[PDB]
Amino acid sequence: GIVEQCCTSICSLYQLENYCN
Amino acid sequence: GIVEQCCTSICSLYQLENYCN
Amino acid sequence: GIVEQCCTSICSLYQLENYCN
Amino acid sequence: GIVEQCCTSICSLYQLENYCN
Amino acid sequence: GIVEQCCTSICSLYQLENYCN
Amino acid sequence: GIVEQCCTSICSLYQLENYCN
Amino acid sequence: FVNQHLCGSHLVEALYLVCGERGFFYTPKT
Amino acid sequence: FVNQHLCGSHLVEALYLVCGERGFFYTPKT
Amino acid sequence: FVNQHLCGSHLVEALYLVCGERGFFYTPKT
Amino acid sequence: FVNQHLCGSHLVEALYLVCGERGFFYTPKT
Amino acid sequence: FVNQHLCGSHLVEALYLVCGERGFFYTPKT
Amino acid sequence: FVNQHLCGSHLVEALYLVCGERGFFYTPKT
Ligand SMILES: [Cl-]
Ligand SMILES: [Cl-]
Ligand SMILES: [Zn+2]
Ligand SMILES: [Zn+2]
């Protein structure tokens, strides 16, 4: 999930938009 | 809603807890 | 400027990006 | 102290109330 | 007090330093 | 640079003033 | 615990600490 | 923009920034 | 609620949240 | 992305996330 | 250093950075 | 005052605190 995508790995700001409602 | 309540008025941690998954 | 704009009005991340080195 | 209880180890929110005045 | 001063007016880091242990 | 001086190593608050404009 | 006055990103911080590994949803009006 | 490690409270701050009014979910169990 | 690791500035943010008006002490030497 | 309302240290946070390892300059008026 | 305008949790942040390992007390009015 | 490790968003928060109105540059490549 997010933690893996963005914390453990790295992510863009666009990826983080995946978790918007 | 909670987002607006906590800002325009006050809210509790117990009320916050309702937004946990 | 940007510092004042984002606070008194609104700003975008794209506008923010102009301040990157 | 706090650092050991809450940072080094983990603590609850109730434990953190131990450090209120 | 300091909490109120820094918010309603301004305060310095030197004034802040008085609240260190 | 800053990251080395202040994150990797440690720095004072006075050192951080080196990066003011 | 004490009552809170929380705007913007301070709300999200507070939800974060409160919910922990449970996580939360942030759903403002409009 | 860029890619960085965004963890804990920093991650939900970034979600808040990016999503804003849309709202978001922070669901670390997945 | 939950239990997490709360360190540095994150710890005093949590103390602020929990204590608020009561005030608190942050005394890392102990 | 959504538009932002950012004061004080929230602006600096937003610049930080946006610029990453590129870094940024913070230059308020006066 | 420059003078500061600090409310809420921003004050606590500022105390944190200023005092370091000495720590501090946060004591608002009332 | 003190010396601590100041990293990432915490570093630019400290720069903001210390520099304020003067403005600052955060240039991690150096
Ligand atoms: Cl951290
Ligand atoms: Cl604010
Ligand atoms: Zn704020
Ligand atoms: Zn942090």
Reported as type and span, the H/E element at residue I24 is strand I24-26
**Experimental method, per PDB record:** X-ray
- Are L11 and L2 in contact by the 8 Å Cβ rule? The answer is no
Burial class (CB in 10 A: 0-12, 13-18, 19+), E1: exposed
Distance (Å) from the C-alpha of residue J30 to the closest C-alpha of chain A?
31
Distance between Cα I14 and ligand 3 center (Å): 15
Our answer on whether J and D touch (3+ beta-carbon pairs < 8 Å) is no
CA-to-CA separations, B2 to B7, H15, L4, in angstroms, rounded? 8, 18, 37
- C-alpha A18: how far from chain center: 7
Distance CA C5, CA J3 (A): 12
Cα–Cα distance between I3 and L9 in angstroms, integer? 24
Final resolution, Å:
1.6
> Looking at chain J, which subunits does it touch, using at least 3 CB pairs closer than 8 Å as the criterion?
A, C, G, H, K, L
CB contact H9 to A (< 8 Å): no
What one-character DSSP code corresponds to residue B20?
B
Backbone angles phi, psi at J11, to 5 degrees: -60, -45
Token readout for I14 is: 């949590």
